[PDB]
Amino acid sequence: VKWPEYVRVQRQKKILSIRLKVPPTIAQFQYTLDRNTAAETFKLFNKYRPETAAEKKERLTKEAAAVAEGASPKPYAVKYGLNHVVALIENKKAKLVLIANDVDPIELVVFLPALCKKMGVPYAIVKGKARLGTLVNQKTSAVAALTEVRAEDEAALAKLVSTIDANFADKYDEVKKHWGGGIL
Template identity: 65%
Template sequence: MTCRNPILFQWSNDPRESEATLECSQCLSSVELWKLAPVKKSKVAPAPYPASKKGAAKAPVNPLIEKTPKNFGVGQDIQPIKDLSRYVKWPEYVRLQRQRKILNQRLKVPPALNQFTQVLDKNTATQLFKLANKYRPETRIEKKERLTAAAAAQVEKGDKAETKKPFVVKYGINHITALVEAKKASLVVIADDVDPIEIVVWLPALCRKMGIPYVIVKGKARLGTVVHKKTATALAFTEVRAEDKSELASLVSAIKSNYTEKNETARKAWGGGLMGFKSNMKMVKRANAVKNSL
């Protein structure tokens, strides 16, 4: 059945209808539609400028200050400051001493060499150098002045004046060795950073053999300042003035208690054998893999 008034058709909203139909408002006739496309609802166009939210006012911008963004490309702005010590080509002596330190940590070090890692504590070392500075040998200028004054006195009086032997610390490895073998040394002070170490590696054993107290301290340069040299491998006390004998005796007893007896077991122990961070992480990873496989 067809209707001649298609303009009066309207949608049927009856949910019982299985297909979309049109009903005429006059004859109430219905027309079945095949695959009728749904009508799309028209969207309202958005406003050209969104409304600003209340309370979100922009901060005033100073027109005198201009933004100057930096470009860190090649040949552009200067790069920011950073630590470049990793990329520094260090001098050869710095590289050698760092490599030597790492090798002494990684490899097994025999007791004769490992004993030089045990040094005197700071407080006792301060007392030691305080006493040693009282017995510094004369410099070349002081020696020249002394000989000039003695020669002038000899010219005036006509006879040579008798001079007393000064009390000074002894230095020089051969001289100290002779003093130790003759048992004339009261105390021997050895540097821990002598290079090559073969110069003094046997000296502690010789001191123990002859029964002479010895001590290992930090810095051959510090020993050198006592005798007006750049460096000194060892120093030796032989004789001191009467007013300093008690101080030397107390210093020797402090060294025996704080150094000799304390490091007796460490003196016989092997050193080194310490792995680095990367090796430790590899061992941990390997141990975890074995643990997970079980």
């Protein structure tokens, strides 16, 4: 068989991702949250979709069509920029910080799991920047945080913290050690 240039490059990059010995601040990724806990994290995170551009436009025209002719609490949503998440973390305004494992330059998000372990922020490296993108009206998100919450979802969030602490942080205490990628 004969493949294209770019196909050969991404296949070569795939086998290069495995066969090299890798520094332990990377490969701290790919030791990621399993299927049940990931689905359960999103069962909470899907309840806080940031109000999409169409929804925001129609509502704020509803404000105009009503209020100009003839009280609300602050609404809660997931928080999704890297400047803003690393702002929220270190201010301790973060209760659950979700980090993508696949980022275009890897160097972007390498400090973040260990800065979360430093601040005492209960983090989870979840699989897919696309999968984080879906819950946030963006193609990709790299990071998603949950600062404040409705009280109906509060107990579920606190348990999501404790499940992620037990499932992720306790199973992967060896991941701060051990250079990954020694696969023969």
